[PDB]
Write an enzyme that holds these catalytic residues in place. Structure first.
Site, short mmCIF file in Angstrom:
data_model
loop_
_atom_site.label_atom_id
_atom_site.label_comp_id
_atom_site.label_asym_id
_atom_site.label_seq_id
_atom_site.Cartn_x
_atom_site.Cartn_y
_atom_site.Cartn_z
N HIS B 351 0.79 -1.24 0.00
CA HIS B 351 0.00 0.00 0.00
C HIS B 351 0.83 1.29 0.00
CE1 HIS B 351 -3.99 -1.93 0.77
NE2 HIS B 351 -3.24 -2.85 1.35
N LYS B 542 -7.98 14.69 4.57
CA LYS B 542 -7.10 13.53 4.57
C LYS B 542 -6.14 13.69 5.75
CE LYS B 542 -6.11 14.56 0.36
NZ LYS B 542 -5.97 13.39 -0.56
N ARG B 543 -5.46 12.62 6.12
CA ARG B 543 -4.49 12.70 7.21
C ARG B 543 -3.42 13.77 6.91
NH1 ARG B 543 -4.37 8.65 11.31
NH2 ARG B 543 -2.55 9.85 12.01
N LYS B 548 1.39 14.64 1.41
CA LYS B 548 0.08 15.06 0.93
C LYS B 548 0.01 16.57 0.65
CE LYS B 548 -2.31 11.20 3.21
NZ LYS B 548 -3.13 10.52 2.15
N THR B 650 -8.05 7.26 -2.01
CA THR B 650 -9.43 6.80 -2.14
C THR B 650 -10.40 7.95 -1.91
OG1 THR B 650 -9.39 6.03 0.15
CG2 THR B 650 -9.05 4.37 -1.59
N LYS B 654 -14.10 9.26 -3.86
CA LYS B 654 -15.30 9.71 -3.15
C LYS B 654 -15.79 11.06 -3.67
CE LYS B 654 -13.36 7.56 1.02
NZ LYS B 654 -12.83 7.85 2.39
O1 LIG Z 1 -4.52 1.38 -0.40
C1 LIG Z 1 -5.18 2.13 0.62
C2 LIG Z 1 -4.32 3.36 0.97
O2 LIG Z 1 -3.14 2.88 1.66
C3 LIG Z 1 -2.30 3.95 2.16
C4 LIG Z 1 -1.13 3.34 2.93
C5 LIG Z 1 -1.54 3.54 4.39
C6 LIG Z 1 -0.89 3.00 5.50
C7 LIG Z 1 -1.47 3.11 6.77
C8 LIG Z 1 -0.81 2.58 7.88
C9 LIG Z 1 0.42 1.94 7.72
C10 LIG Z 1 1.00 1.83 6.46
C11 LIG Z 1 0.34 2.36 5.35
N1 LIG Z 1 -2.61 4.34 4.42
O3 LIG Z 1 -3.02 4.75 3.11
C12 LIG Z 1 -1.79 4.84 1.00
O4 LIG Z 1 -1.03 5.96 1.50
C13 LIG Z 1 -2.96 5.34 0.12
O5 LIG Z 1 -2.48 5.97 -1.07
C14 LIG Z 1 -3.87 4.16 -0.27
O6 LIG Z 1 -5.01 4.65 -0.99
#
Ligand SMILES: OC[C@H]1O[C@@]2(CC(c3ccccc3)=NO2)[C@H](O)[C@@H](O)[C@@H]1O
Ligand SMILES: OC[C@H]1O[C@@]2(CC(c3ccccc3)=NO2)[C@H](O)[C@@H](O)[C@@H]1O
Lengths: 810, 810
Positions: B351, B542-543, B548, B650, B654
């Site tokens: 991810h 967003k976070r 970002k 994501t 939305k």
């Molecule tokens: O695939 C779902 C989403 O995954 C991420 C990755 C992520 C994450 C959260 C906690 C630990 C490691 C990674 N949060 O968002 C990505 O940053 C985001 O781009 C993606 O849409």
């Protein structure tokens, strides 16, 4: 099946069956294909619970409309046991549910065994609170029990290698269907901080806050449609608590530890900070709730007319200075008026005279935890001692004896003294105990305020302790005298006219034999232990403590064994000697006594010469649910505390009601039990209180008895030499040393009379007809010991309210 | 009211009303006299929950009878949000419940606001898991979500003095009506201990045991009567745990801390022991549950035919060596066979490519906590590297690059490398991201095993993210093209034929205006903040993270302010700029960015010259429930990450679905969104991945942009001098220093193109008709981004199962 269990009407049975199936589906999310006995228990519990709710809602709204005087029973302990059967009994649903479950292909008694005990108490004190709640509801009093919802109650006892092991009583693991969380009524409780004096009185500032969340449990009265509330507080951290981030969230546990676990001490004071926090926690949350309810009915002159607070021992004694704090600091009443209200509101029940059980809190602990309360306690003490000085001028020693503050190495607050000063009534729990209070430990206080001192002899509820646990006995009684006695136990006196009735004699003995067979079967099924159902069931069940003298029982057991070994081919009345009870985890001597009992069993139970003539069994994990099984099965009740040490006892009353004869000292309620039944119908032995006093003046020398009683010498030699512990010869050296050199409870002094009295017991047991006739005379005179009688007396003589047997509309 | 919300039949409404009243009475133990809105919420929740149970029981028994391949989705995060409305939507009960509550004198939307979010995730990754569960149920897959039941989810964010404050998310305080505790399915999890080698393999001994208790939550599919399960584990101490006595009971907290709190890190790896415990806890309990279910269907050759395990990033990567452990040590399979089964069972989704987010666990931690797993990991590494050495002989650097074990100051295990080795499929989450994986960070692995690497572009569920949150838009669409699109989002392409339809243009713009009015009202009611509903709603939610680039947004905002101040009497398109999101508590720079945003608002919002032309608002406590409110109200979606840093995104999808236009870089799923809609219908700006690569080769010098862009220089001077913090002139020195000297994300490099692109946005907004026509072209081409499409691809290309839209009997 049996009449006292109510009707099983077609409509009721059909409705119970459908609601059972509804709960299994919607509540438990199961079907009959994957459901286990536990699922079936919960489906039944939810079905029965549904019948409480209407009555519960209408009872509480009735109190709001009528606005009667409310009774608040504050206790750190409520030993409730199981709730399912009790609820069915009080709602007259037992036969209907038995039928409904039977038609579903289930055995209701099997389902009942799945429920965990609510073990939120140590023994007698906690169980008294539970019986009291039952009686208050049955007598139609607007009563509320207030306590702590411990996550862990009294530990589960396992016996491993003859030793007690403790494990956590995780009673909430599967959930509690009886309680209703009320998070919306959460109240803040304050700790630590400091006192700030302003232009307008003192202010308690910079405090740490813990939230008190209430859980309500219904308390049904006996077939009167009254359902009262027991409200138990649980500790919660505020959401900004300690707010790196992760550790701060983890540290919430520190606040929530307040309601985590019951202190497992019976008749012993442990001066730990956590216990003090528990005591203030329950007091502070409860008092806010009381005041809120009073305001939702400005004029605190009427407070005592609408509120009674009963303190169950000194454990909630902080209610006195907390009430003063709220009235003076928050409501802005003058001291003298606030004090008048407090005294008229509060009453105190003392439950023990053992010095090590009395609460004496170090000043330094109260200074840090509750600085404002300490200041208030000091002010109470000054004003009280000014009264004493006016009444007894120049009596300087009286002033130091009566002070709430005790000087010494560490300064302490005597909480009993605080309670007497701040209460309008002080009572003991049996006639002998109440007299002891006036003559000894509270003599000075009785001289100052004689009108304050009362007696309220303890009792037990005949619902749980007869109808529930012994339906067979309840039924044979009902056949002769009707059902009224269940809420009017004095009616049992009518059974005196059946003492020569041959049919009744037969039925009483039949019911006992059946109970004995059932219990003998229970022991084999759950513990694989084998006993003779024809033997005399000799039972001592109660917490393990030196004052209760399980050791004296042990000496008699060894005496019997030694006599059999000396003359093997001589007939003796066969006995099964059963001893059970928990020891406080930090109580070394009590743990040693348990090991001794099992060690005696190891020798006696495997000696081929003894055979089935003598068996010694330690009953593991004694608790309310086990009491309900063993008490109906007992022939002989052992109530053998040193005269002047057992304040009342309540186990004694349970045995009397269920057809056991009593061997006992003239201690606590035993005295009144013997008075009611007649001394000829009781096996009384040993020193009276006066005899103990005489021995103390002279000096107790255990060696004297050792030298003059050859049978006693033999036992001590056996213990010392390693007869009962061959692989560890000196295992019981601590027990022998205590008995010989520092026995506070004079075990040797009562030995000869005890053994002699036990011979008289065996003699009577040889004559079944005369044994049963004496049993009938005990059951028939047990009426005084109903907690309905006890509560009616509290109501009329302390609380100023009239009990009522009138039904509320269903 | 509206068609897509279902029928309100007379029978249904009558039945819902009676069951509502039943729950209020029997379940909540209240009457209408004392009931609060919260009581009404719970009565409604229980009523709706009842409709799930039949379907839930029959779905699970259907899987037992049919025995299909089961899909296990393992995640440390499930960001579920509220459940009430979602359940009504999927069961077609919304209109019926709306009617029922209306007839009871209640507003259902008011009741919906009482429910707590289930905030068991940080953001995108956790929310993806939630959308996936919804799609798996809607597509009739035998799917199970497995995770941890955190007592505390993502913290609640309070803004105090412009700074973020954290408080505990006590989401379970009032209870959770949706979950069902299953204490009967409790499983043991082992920690610490040591490895003992015997005649018959290795044994893991002397372990500490923590119990895993499951709680099941229903996951309803869209109107197909399928109800799947999300099973979340809670940590429990064994009853003999640490068994002075009191402390031993109190120390149970240590074991139970495992499931206490969610680690609040988004795209950041924190190598703490507690987190490692959480990861093994979920893996060990889950795998036992999987194997049990498989055996209750000896022959593990068929295991991969009946079981698929999807790893949501590396967080549950211990599934690989745990499965090997069970198969080799417990089931006694030979290594090679166990490995074949493991590889065919497991698949891994990556991810993120941010180096600081990748899990690299210190060997010393695994050595102590999981000694047997470390041994297994070493063996996996040796066998894997032997394969690499055979394929690329003599390439010694490849061997060190590909090793699961990383050498250095502290030796670490690369969990991503472990996952690739032990999985049959590895996927990225957007086309650009998946290509980046093959070209850069996993290049070596792609060269060895090209067949393993796949793409699965992310998606969102159109149930929650259209029908639930934007019923007005859902309805106007349904009026034209019917209801089928809700489970077949590709049908939205039919709306292309309405781009010139004057009635549709009007309705789309009308729905947006209504949403904006509603949100403007929400802000005034709950936060007392005032906004112009006629302004362009410019939203970045967003976070908070440097990648970002909330900072780039801030620079544009200040640019707009400065331009207004330079020429006050010139017309500009009015904007409301809204920025919201949480910062990880330990992330200093992210916390500083929040303070900057509020500091800009403090200046801009109170400047009389600006007026209603520009407003800057920080949206407090951004979470799923707030997303459902603000997204439907948005005009402009800010998706402005540095090219190559946002794996997918994501939130972007939305906004596209709900009628906002997008300003964005060619990053993550933005690329495919622009491809679907056409680049003419997207506001694309800035560096592409290749341009970032070129700048990195050259060296990024922020000073160059500062020197050549006068408008940028002004902003930096304002920040440095204390224009936005007069009382603390150097407050933002850290931000300026980072921007000028160590900006990993090249904020200055995209500034000019961004501002230029924003001017084009304002130009289009001046022409409402053409703005709306472009919106229609976005909504119409958003179909690809349904999570139904995503899950269908996982199903067919990874799991080897066929999705089904067939209804189960009700
Ligand atoms: O695939 C779902 C989403 O995954 C991420 C990755 C992520 C994450 C959260 C906690 C630990 C490691 C990674 N949060 O968002 C990505 O940053 C985001 O781009 C993606 O849409
Ligand atoms: O009044 C109820 C009972 O109260 C006692 C006192 C007691 C106790 C328990 C805990 C702390 C202090 C005292 N448990 O039992 C007394 O020991 C017992 O005799 C009496 O029957």
């Amino acid at each position: 099946q049996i009449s006292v269990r109510g009707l099983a009407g077609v409509e009721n049975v059909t409705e119970l069956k459908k609601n059972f199936n509804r709960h299994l589906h919607f509540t438990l999310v199961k079907d009959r294909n994957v459901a286990t006995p536990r699922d079936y228990y919960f489906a039944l519990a939810h079905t029965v619970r549904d019948h409480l709710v209407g009555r519960w809602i209408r009872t509480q709204q009735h109190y709001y409309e009528k606005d009667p005087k409310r009774i608040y029973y504050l206790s750190l302990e409520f030993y409730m046991g199981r709730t399912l059967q009790n609820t069915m009994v009080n709602l007259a649903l037992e036969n209907a549910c038995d039928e409904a479950t039977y038609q579903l292909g289930l055995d209701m008694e099997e389902l009942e065994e799945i429920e965990e005990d609510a073990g939120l108490g140590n023994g007698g004190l906690g169980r008294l609170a539970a019986c009291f709640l039952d009686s208050m509801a049955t007598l139609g009093l607007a009563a509320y029990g207030y306590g702590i919802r411990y996550e862990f109650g009294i530990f589960n006892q396992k016996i491993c290698g003859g030793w007690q092991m403790e494990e956590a009583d995780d009673w909430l693991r599967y959930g509690n269907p009886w309680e209703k969380a009320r998070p919306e009524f959460t109240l803040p409780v304050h700790f630590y901080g400091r006192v700030e004096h302003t232009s307008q009185g003192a202010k308690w500032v910079d405090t740490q806050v813990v939230l008190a969340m209430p859980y309500d449990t219904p308390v049904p009265g006996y077939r009167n449609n009254v359902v009262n509330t027991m409200r138990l507080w649980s500790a919660k951290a505020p959401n900004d608590f300690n707010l790196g981030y992760i550790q701060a969230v983890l540290d919430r546990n520190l606040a929530e530890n307040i309601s985590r676990v019951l202190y497992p001490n019976d008749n012993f004071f442990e001066g730990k900070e956590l216990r003090l926090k528990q005591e203030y926690f329950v007091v502070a949350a409860t008092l806010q709730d009381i005041i809120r309810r009073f305001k939702s009915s400005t004029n605190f002159d009427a407070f005592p007319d609408k509120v009674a607070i009963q303190l169950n021992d000194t454990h909630p004694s902080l209610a006195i200075p907390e009430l003063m704090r709220v009235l003076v600091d928050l409501e802005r009443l003058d001291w003298d008026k606030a004090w008048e209200v407090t005294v008229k509101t509060c009453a105190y029940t003392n439950h023990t005279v053992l010095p090590e059980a009395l609460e004496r809190w170090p000043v330094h602990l109260l200074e840090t935890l509750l600085p404002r309360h300490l200041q208030i306690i000091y002010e109470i003490n000054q004003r009280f001692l000014n009264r004493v000085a006016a009444a007894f001028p120049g009596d300087v020693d009286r002033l130091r004896r009566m002070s709430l503050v005790e000087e010494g190495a560490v300064k302490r607050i005597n909480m009993a003294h605080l309670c007497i000063a701040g209460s309008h009534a002080v009572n003991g729990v049996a006639r002998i105990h109440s007299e002891i209070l006036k003559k000894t430990i509270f003599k000075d206080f009785y001289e100052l305020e004689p009108h304050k001192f009362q007696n309220k002899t303890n009792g037990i509820t005949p619902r749980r302790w007869l109808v529930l646990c012994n339906p067979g006995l309840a039924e044979i009684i009902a056949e002769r005298i009707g059902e009224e006695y269940i809420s009017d136990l004095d009616q049992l006196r009518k059974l005196l006219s059946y003492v020569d009735d041959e049919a009744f004699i037969r039925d009483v003995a039949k019911v006992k034999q059946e109970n004995k067979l059932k219990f003998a079967a229970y022991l084999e099924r759950e513990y694989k232990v084998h006993i003779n159902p024809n033997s005399l069931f000799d039972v001592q069940v109660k917490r393990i403590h030196e004052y209760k003298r399980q050791l004296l029982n042990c000496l008699h057991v060894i005496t019997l064994y030694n006599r059999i070994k000396k003359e093997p081919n001589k007939f003796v009345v066969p006995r099964t000697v059963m001893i059970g009870g928990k020891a406080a985890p930090g109580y070394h001597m009590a743990k040693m006594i348990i090991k001794l009992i099992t060690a005696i069993g190891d020798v006696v139970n495997h000696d081929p010469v003894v055979g089935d003539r003598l068996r010694v069994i330690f009953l593991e994990n004694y608790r309310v649910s086990l009491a309900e099984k063993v008490i109906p099965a007992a022939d002989l009740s052992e109530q053998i505390s040193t005269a002047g040490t057992e304040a009342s006892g309540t186990g004694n009353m349970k045995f009397m009601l269920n057809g056991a004869l009593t061997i006992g000292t003239m201690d606590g309620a035993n005295v009144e039990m013997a008075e009611e039944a007649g001394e000829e119908n009781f096996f009384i032995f040993g020193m009276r209180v006066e005899d103990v006093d005489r021995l103390d003046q002279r000096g107790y020398n255990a060696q004297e008895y050792y030298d003059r009683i050859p049978e006693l010498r033999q036992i001590i030699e056996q213990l010392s030499s390693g007869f009962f512990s061959p692989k560890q010869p000196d295992l019981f050296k601590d027990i022998v040393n205590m008995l010989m050199h520092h026995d506070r409870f004079k075990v040797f002094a009562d030995y000869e009379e005890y053994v002699k009295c036990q011979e008289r017991v065996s003699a009577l047991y040889k004559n079944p007809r005369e044994w049963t006739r004496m049993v009938i005379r005990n059951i028939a005179t047990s009426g005084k010991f109903s907690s309905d009688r006890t509560i009616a007396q509290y109501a009329r003589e302390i609380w100023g309210v009239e009990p009522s047997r009138q039904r509320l509309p269903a």
